Amino acid sequence: PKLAACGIVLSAWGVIMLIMLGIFFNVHSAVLIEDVPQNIYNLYEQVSYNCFIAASLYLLLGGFS
Amino acid sequence: TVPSILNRMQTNQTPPTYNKTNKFTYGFQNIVDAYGIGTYREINPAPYT
Amino acid sequence: LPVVIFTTFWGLIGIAGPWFVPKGPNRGVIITMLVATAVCCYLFWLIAILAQLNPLFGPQLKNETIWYVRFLW
Secondary structure (H helix, E strand, O other): OOOHHHHHHHHHHHHHHHHHHHHHHHOOOOOOOOOOOOOOHHHHHHHHHHHHHHHOOOHHHEEEO | OOOOOOOOOOOOOOOOOOOOOOOOOOOOEEEEEOOOOOOOOOOOOOOOO | OOOOOHHOOOOOOOOOOOOOOOOOHHHHHHHHHHHHHHHHHHHHHHHHHHHOOOOOOOOOOOOOOOOOOOOOO
């Protein structure tokens, strides 16, 4: 009951927090240059591709719960 | 038919303190009174709190 | 300069604040709520823009962050 109830509020935060992480990495923000091992912008969008497919993966946990 | 009457006294007993309080300003009021409830007609810190 | 701009934009509440208040029983609390929000929040901004005004230091930056924001700013 509560493990089904705690999962939706984590997923509702998991879709809000990780989408904005996707948009902040799409705009190639200057504060986030620690996570990068015109060419450097493509690495930034790659992390935004990474974030979004985990932001969408929390929607599946919402329907399962 | 006989009325109940209300007589005001003039004692020197210390009156209690009371605060007008909404549902909003109730939590800020009893977080001041948890330390010490104020004297009669003292400056209430709870609007500034 | 925002210092001559924000002195009246946080000065609207607290001077024109008690001028437009409804006549309900919460007048002595909402005016206290509006004035103290104008005093605390504006002075919090005031002691932060004065710390950077006339400074003494410079940002010690990492070596990858020497040439990076030349393309970004």
